[PDB]
Amino acid sequence: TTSAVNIYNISAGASVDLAAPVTTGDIVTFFSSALNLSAGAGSPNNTALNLLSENGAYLLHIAFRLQENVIVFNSRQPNAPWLVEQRVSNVANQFIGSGGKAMVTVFDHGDKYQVVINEKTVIQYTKQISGTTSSLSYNSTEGTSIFSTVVEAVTYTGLA
Amino acid sequence: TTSAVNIYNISAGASVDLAAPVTTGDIVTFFSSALNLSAGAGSPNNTALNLLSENGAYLLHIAFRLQENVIVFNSRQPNAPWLVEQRVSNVANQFIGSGGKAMVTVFDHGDKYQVVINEKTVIQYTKQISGTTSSLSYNSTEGTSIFSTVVEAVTYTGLA
Ligand SMILES: OC[C@H]1O[C@@H](O[C@H]2[C@H](O)[C@@H](O)[C@H](O)O[C@@H]2CO)[C@H](O)[C@@H](O)[C@H]1O
Ligand SMILES: OC[C@H]1O[C@@H](O[C@H]2[C@H](O)[C@@H](O)[C@H](O)O[C@@H]2CO)[C@H](O)[C@@H](O)[C@H]1O
């Protein structure tokens, strides 16, 4: 009876293939050592965190938009259009926990993803696409990330 | 099928009560923003991390001893003596390519606690005192702790 922990640094703009895969029952948390909710204007995304499947599809895209004051979730296929957007308003509100740092956890629930920011569940995203996560990525628009330039992802796998 | 993330700030010498007790299937991770592998000696423990009950049984005690150069895993009842110690030899070899921070993960697997330093499992530990983890502490000697002044503890609960 053995689960695993895996630890990745992700620079803004970079992707990472996962040493182990995230499937149902598993957890991935993105840790940022800074929080800039006065950061300015994304075009449109201040920061996006992404779970990507084997072929470069987005199972989950989490995008913080200060100037639109929303957090935007979505999925898509590789080279195909962005699917049905979901939104949660007030960005700065979901972060009242820690100043100067934050964490974003994605609980893979099989049919959904629970997304928790620090201690607060911000969406129970019903999946638009099924599949194993093999890749995580972090983007920003330069000069306006709400998060550090490096984000530490930790994965807890072997859970099921 | 909804999970909880709880975050806790533990200073050396302190104890914290979990708003969501840890049980079979659950996870604690302790995050040190420091790694001082030349801080010793301890008395004997440079650093200790503890998973307790409401009745205050040490369900899992993890002590780091630089001088004896060992990680001790033990448990004890409230106001009683320690049980059968388990010892892992060679402290810095448990932190291979750690750098200037560390994390320690405990999995509650029911029969055994699975302890992982960063990405390396260090022990599968046959429970000597059973049940759910209801509390956490961080103990250090003098200023000889191998971790940072404050450790951040993240619990993942409601997993199975
Ligand atoms: O859906 C996430 C996706 O949005 C793109 O921007 C959209 C915008 O959200 C939509 O309402 C607008 O009308 O058109 C834009 C282009 O699809 C982002 O550019 C993309 O990166 C994701 O963040
Ligand atoms: O065993 C957990 C507990 O150990 C104590 O030290 C032990 C020690 O490992 C053994 O060699 C010793 O001489 O008997 C001791 C029990 O008194 C530490 O004092 C303690 O803080 C814990 O880590």
* Backbone angles phi and psi of B91, in degrees to 5: -60, -55
Rounded distance from Cα B141 to ligand 2 centre (Å): 14
**Radius of gyration of chain A from its Cα atoms, rounded to whole angstroms:** 15
**A1-160: what CATH class?**
mainly beta
Asked if residues B10 and B16 have their Cβ atoms less than 8 Å apart, the reply is yes
Give, as one character, the DSSP assignment of residue A56: S
Residue in A44, A55, A156 with CA at minimum distance from that of residue B116: A156
Question: Kindly report the CA angle at A133 between A85 and A75, in degrees rounded to 5?
Answer: 10
Residue B80's CB is within 10 A of a number of other CB atoms, namely 10
Sign (positive/negative) of CA torsion A78, A83, A88, A89? positive
Which tokens in the block code for residue B104? 């320690």
Method: X-ray
Residue B131's CB is within 10 A of a number of other CB atoms, namely 15
The reply to whether ligand 1 has any atom less than 6 angstroms from the CB of A49 is no
Residue in A54, A65, A82, A73 with CA at minimum distance from that of residue A127: A73
Give, as one character, the DSSP assignment of residue A79: T
In Å, what is the CA distance from A78 to each residue of A53, A64, A130, B78, B129?
9, 22, 13, 57, 50
**Residue A136 and residue A29: Cα distance in Å, rounded?**
11
**Residue A133 and residue A139: Cα distance in Å, rounded?**
17
The number of angstroms, rounded, from the C-alpha of B98 to the middle of its chain's C-alpha atoms is 17
Residue in B22, B115, B21, B102 with CA at minimum distance from that of residue B62: B115
Asked if residues B87 and B71 have their Cβ atoms less than 8 Å apart, the reply is yes
Inter-chain touch B29–A154, beta carbons under 8 Å: yes
| Residue of B85, B129, B137, B145 to mutate, ligand 2, most atoms within 8 A of C-beta | B85
Q: What is the DSSP string of B68-80?
A: TTEEEEEEE-TTS
Domain ranges of chain A: 1-160
Asked if residues B86 and B72 have their Cβ atoms less than 8 Å apart, the reply is yes
Which tokens in the block code for residue A160? 């099921």
Contacts with B29 from chain A: Cβ below 8 Å:
5, 154
Rounded distance from Cα A50 to ligand 2 centre (Å): 46
Q: What is the DSSP string of B76-131?
A: E-TTS-B---EEEE-GGGGSTT--S-EEEEEEE-SSEEEEEETTEEEEEEE-SS-S
**Residue A8 and residue B50: Cα distance in Å, rounded?**
26
To which residue do tokens 């983890």 refer?
A: B133
Atom of ligand 2 nearest to the CA of B63: 23
Q: What is the resolution of the experimental data for this entry, in Å?
A: 1.9
Q: What is the DSSP string of B29-66?
A: EEEES---TT----SS-SEEEEEE-TT--EEEEEEEET
